[PDB]
Amino acid sequence: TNMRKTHPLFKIINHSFIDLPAPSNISSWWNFGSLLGVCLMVQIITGLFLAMHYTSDTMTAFSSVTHICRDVNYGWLIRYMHANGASMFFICLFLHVGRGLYYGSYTFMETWNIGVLLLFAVMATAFMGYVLPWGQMSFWGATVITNLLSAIPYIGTTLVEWIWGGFSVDKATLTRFFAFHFILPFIIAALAIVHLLFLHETGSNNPTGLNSDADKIPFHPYYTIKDILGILIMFLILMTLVLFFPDMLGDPDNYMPANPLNTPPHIKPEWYFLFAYAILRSIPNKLGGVLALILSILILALMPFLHTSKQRSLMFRPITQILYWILVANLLILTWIGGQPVEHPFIIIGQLASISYFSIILILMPISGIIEDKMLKLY
Amino acid sequence: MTNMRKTHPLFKIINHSFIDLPAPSNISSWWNFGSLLGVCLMVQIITGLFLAMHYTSDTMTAFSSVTHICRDVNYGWLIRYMHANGASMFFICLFLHVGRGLYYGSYTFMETWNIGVLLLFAVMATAFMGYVLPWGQMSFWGATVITNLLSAIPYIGTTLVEWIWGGFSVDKATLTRFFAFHFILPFIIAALAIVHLLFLHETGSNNPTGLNSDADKIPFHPYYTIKDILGILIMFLILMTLVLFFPDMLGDPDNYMPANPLNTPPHIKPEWYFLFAYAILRSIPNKLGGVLALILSILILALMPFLHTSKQRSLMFRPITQILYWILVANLLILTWIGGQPVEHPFIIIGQLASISYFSIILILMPISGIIEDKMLKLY
C-alpha cells in the first residue's frame, strides 16, 4: 500500500536514507562523508554557472574570468565559491581519509578502493580546473608538473606530446583541459554512487570498532538532522572563507595574464597537492620522484594489507595512536616544506619527512600493532 | 565456493539486467531500437567529447573553430559528421521506438512511458541547442525564430525570453550558455534512461502478441545480446554510409555561412526531426495557440495511456486501428514535408488538414475504433 516500501524509485531512497540501520554512536567525523557529497553538488552547480560565461581560448580566458567577476551579476560570488569550495572539498576529503585510517575503515576493501579511485579523479579534476583560468601560475604549474610527468624513457615524451596536443602547453591543451574538467565530476558522481553501494552491503563503522548490530538506529530522523547541522557548519566555514578572506588560500601570481616568457621566482601548485610535491622533490631523480609520488598516493591502497592487530579501531591502541598523530604531524610538515623553496634547511627536512612518512606507514604501524597484541597477552 | 556473477553486488546488478534477464522469446526487430538508442547516445557522448576538445563557444571564434576542426584536426571531419549524422540517426531510432510503443500497446507501462516522454523532451532540447552551437546562419536564425515564438505566452514571455537570451537578442552569452547546456543535458538523459530501465525491469517487457509472455521466456544472454550486436552493426552500416558517402543531405547548405544578424535567409526551417512540429505551429494563425498546440501534441503523446478503450493490448488482432495507425504515420510524413515547405499555396490548407487529422486520429478515432472492434468481436 505505502509508496515508501513498494514504489521502485522510493524503495531505493528508503533503503539508503530513511530506514537504513546506522550505528548509534558514530561521531561528527562520519558527517564529513555526506559533506563531501554536498561539496560535489555545490561544485557542479557553481561550475555550471561558470560555464555559461567561460570562453576556452588562450586569448579570451583571463578576460572572460575578469568579465565574470566585474560584469556578470554576482559572478564574483560564484567564482570565489567555486575556488573556496574546491578548497573545502579537499579539507573534507582529507578528514574523510583520516577517519578511514584511524577507525579501521579500510577493511571494507571494495569501498576503500573505490574511494582511492575517487581521490585520484578529484585530484586530476582540481588540477585541470586550476589550469583553466590561464594565469601565470596556471600555465607554469601545468608546464612544470606535466614536463616532470614526461620523465619515463621512450614512452613519456610521446605521452606528453599527446597530452599537450603540441610542442608545449597551448590552446589545444586549454580546450581539452576544459572538456576534461567539465566531464570528470560526473564520473566522480557515478563512482560515489558505486562507493555508497559498496558501503551499504555491510553498514557503517563505529568509533569503538565493534559490531554495532546490537544497537542500531534508523538514519531518519537522527542522522538526517545531524548531517543538516554539519552542512550548516560547513556553509559557515565556506561563506566565511568566500565573503571575508576570498584569496587567503589563493595565490596572487595567478592574477597576472599568462606570459610564456615570464618564469616566476617560485612555482607551486595549490596547497592540497603540496605535500606530494614535497615528496616529489625529496628524491633527486625524476623517475624516482614521480614513482615516489605514485607510491605516496597509492600507499592508501596498500593500507588494508598492512593491518596486524586483532582489534580494528585505534580507540584501544595508544602506541599506534601516537604513531598516527606523528604521521599527521609529518604530513603537515610536508605541506609546509612543499610551500617552501628548495634551499637549506628545507631539503634535508623534506627528505627526513618523506622517509619518516613511508617508514611510519609501511614499517612502524604493523610493528606497533604486533607489540600491542603481545602487550595484551594474546600473541 | 560461490558464484561471483550472483553474489558480487554490481555483478548481481548487471546479471539481473543484462545476462539472466527473462525476456520474451518472440520480440521482433522493433525491440532492438532501445539498445540502438543507448549505443547512439554513447556514440554522441564520445564524439561530442572529442569535438569539445577543440570547440570554442565564442561568436568571433566558433565558425572558425568548426572549420579548424574540419580542416586541421586529424579526422575532425569524421568525428564532426559522425556527431551530426548520429543526431539524425538518434532521432530515427527515437521515432521508431515511440512507434513500437504506440503500435504494440507498450504505453500501459505508464511510468516507463512517462519517463520516456521526459527523455524525448530532453533529447529534443539537447539537439536544438547543439544545432545552435556551430553558429552558422541557420543556427542563429533558427534560435531567433524559436525564442521569439516562445515570447508569446502572456505577461512572462518577454521576461523569460530575455532571461534565456542573456540579453535583448541572440548573442555570445546565449552561445556560451547553450554550449554549457548542450554539454550537460545528455548526462541527465543517461540518468533518466537508467530510471527508464529500472521501471521496465520492474514491470517486465512486452511482446508483439500483447499476451502474457511468462509462459515462454528466454534469458537475455546469448540471444538478445547477439541480436543487439547485429542491430548495432546494421546501424553502424547506415550511419557510416551516410557519413562517408552523403555527408550533407540531412542538413542545410546555408549553415556553412557565418551568422549574420542583418541578412536573413528566405527559408528559415529547423532540422528535419522538428519539421512536423513546425507545421503544427504554422497550422494556427495565433502564436500562443501554436506554442500550446506543439507542447500539447507531445503531451497527448504522453496522455495516450488514458485513451486505451480496447480490451486487447497490441494491434496484432485489430485491423481497423491498424489502418488508423498507418494513416497517422503517413500524416506525420506529410507533416514533415509541409514543415519543409514555404508558407504558400497550397501548403497552408494541407498543413491545417494534416494537423486536424493528426489530433482527430489520436484523440477521437482510435478509441472509437477500439469500441467498434470490441463490438465486432462480441465483447460488448
Place this chain on the structure above:
Amino acid sequence: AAKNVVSQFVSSMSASADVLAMSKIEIKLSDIPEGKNMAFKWRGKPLFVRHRTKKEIDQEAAVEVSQLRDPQHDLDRVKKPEWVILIGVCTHLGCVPIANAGDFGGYYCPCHGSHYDASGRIRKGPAPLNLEVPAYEFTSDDVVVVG
C-alpha cells in the same frame, strides 16, 4: 537563505552590465537639421534618424493599405511625424540604404538596384518586406530614448 541564493543564481544568467551598456546605446541630441538622414551603430545595426516636414508626410499619406506590398499605413507608426526612426538593414542581403534618391526621393540600396520608400517601405524591388522600426520612448524633444 534559500530564496537569496536561488535569486542570485537566477539573476546571474540575466543580461550583464556590458550588455546593458550596449542595449540602450543611443540617447539622441537635436544636432540633426531639417531633412537630413544620419546614421548610428545601435545594437550592431545601422539606425537611421531623419527629420521630416509635413509637406512630404501629407504627400506620403496617399499610400493605401490595400495596394501596399506589406500593409502598413503612414500615420500610426510614428507619434512625432517630424522625426522618423529606421533600421538600415536590407531584408534581401543585409546592405545599407541611402536616402533622398529615386523618383519618389526615398531610400536607395546601392548593392541591389532597389528603391525603398522614404518612410521605409519597399516601393520597387525584390526585397520581400519593408525596413523595420524599433521601439522608442519620448522625453523632451531634444532627447529621444531608443530601446
Place this chain on the structure above:
Amino acid sequence: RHRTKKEIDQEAAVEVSQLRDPQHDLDRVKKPEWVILIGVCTHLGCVPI
C-alpha cells in the same frame, strides 16, 4: 649569431667550476662557429640585444 674566433677561444678558456650553473661550454654548441639559442631574458621576457 655567427660568432668570432676570439670569442670562441675566450669561452673555451672558461673554467667549468667557476660558472654559476654547471654545464660544459664546449658541449653547449654543436658547431663551434655558430650560436643558436633562445633570446628570452629569464625574468619576464625582455628582448636582449
Place this chain on the structure above:
Amino acid sequence: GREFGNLARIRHVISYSLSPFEQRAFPSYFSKGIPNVLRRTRERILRVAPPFVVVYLIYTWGNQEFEQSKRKNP
C-alpha cells in the same frame, strides 16, 4: 538483507526512553558539559599534542635557520 528485523539476536535487554517533547534539549549544559570536555581532553592530550608541539619547534627553527642562511657573514 541488512534491514531492521534480522540484524542481530539480543535477549533479556530492557530499554527505557522518554518523549523528546517532555525532556530538555540542553539538560545541565555547562555544569555537566565542562567536566566531560576536560575529561576527554585529559584522556587524549598526551596522545595528540606533542607531535604538533614538535611541528611548531621545527617550523620556528626552520624559519630562523632560513633567515640566518639568507643573512651574510660579516
Place this chain on the structure above:
Amino acid sequence: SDLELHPPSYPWSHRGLLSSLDHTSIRRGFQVYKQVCSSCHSMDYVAYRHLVGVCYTEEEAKALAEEVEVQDGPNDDGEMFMRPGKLSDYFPKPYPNPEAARAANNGALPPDLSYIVRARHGGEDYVFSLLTGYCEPPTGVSLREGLYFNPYFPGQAIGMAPPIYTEVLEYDDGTPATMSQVAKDVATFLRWASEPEHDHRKRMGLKMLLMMGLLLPLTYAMKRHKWSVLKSRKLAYRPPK
C-alpha cells in the same frame, strides 16, 4: 640582492572585516591615475561605467568619458575614425602593443594595473611602500643609469621613474596634494580597481554572520531535541540465572 624587504601593515580605512572602502579616496585616486599614472599604465578591464555609483555620478562620468578620444570603426568607407568616447568604453591604452611600451620605457614593460594589488604580496601596502619608498642607492651597489633604487621592488632595480612628489596634481575638492596623500589615494583606487565588489561582499558577509549566528543554535537545538530522545535512554539487563 637576494634578501628582500617586506612592506609593513598600514592602518587602512578598509583594513577591518566590516569596514568598506572610502569612496572619496577612490575618487581622488582616480583623479591621480587619470592625471599621472595613465600616461604609461593601462587598466583595460575597467570601464567608465564602473565609476558610476561608486565615486562619480552619471553626468560626471559621462563628461569624463566624453573628454576622451576612442578609435571607433570600421566606417562605411572602410577605415578607422576618431570619435568622442562614451560610458560603455573602457580606459584607453597608453600604447597599441606591449613592444611599443617597451620601446618607450627603456625596455621595461609597465604592467596593467587592473589587478596589481591582487597580484603582489602586500597589495596596497606594497603599492604605498613602492611609491613612497624611493631613496638614493646605498654604497657598494652602483646601479645602471636609467634605473632607480627601490628597496621594495624585488631585485631593488625599478625601471619606473618616481612619479610622486608634493603638488604633482591638484584636487578639485580642496585637499593638500602631498606625496603620502596622493600615494594613499591611488592605493585606495587600485584596491577598488582590483575588487569592485568589495563593499557589497562585506555587506553580504555581515548578513551571513548575523543569519548564521541566528541559525546555528536553532538547528543545534533541533538536533539536541531529536537526539535527546536517545541521549537520556537507559538500558537494563535481565539475566535468568
Place this chain on the structure above:
Amino acid sequence: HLVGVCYTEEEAKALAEEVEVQDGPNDDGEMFMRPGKLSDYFPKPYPNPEAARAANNGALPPDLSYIVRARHGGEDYVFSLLTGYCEPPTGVSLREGLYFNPYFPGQAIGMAPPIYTEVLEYDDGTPATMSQVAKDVATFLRWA
C-alpha cells in the same frame, strides 16, 4: 594545404614566397611586411567587409571557402553561374553595376562576368576556353 594535393612542397613554398604578408609587431613596436610562409593563409583582398562593399559597387563578394557547400546544386551552380551570363530579356530594366545572370536568385547579380576565352595561360598546355576555366575552378572550389 596544397602540398600533396596539387603542388610539391618546394612549389608551394615558392608560391607562398611571392605572397607579401602583414606581420609584426617588431622590436620597434609597429607593423611590418614579410614574404609569406607555408603556414600563411590565402590573402584577403580587403582588410574588412566595408571596404569590400565599397570597392565592389555596394555588393559584398563572399568568401569562397564553403561556397560549394553553401549553395544548392553545389558546383553545378558555380558552373552554371559562371557560364550563364546572358543579356536581359524584353521589358526588364537592368541597372548599371548589375548584370543579368538567370542562375543567381533575383537574376540581377553584382558580379561582372569574370572569365572568357583565354583569360589566363595554363602551365600544362591546356586550351583556355571559358568552359574549361569554369570547370577547373569549380573542381578547385569543390576541393576547397
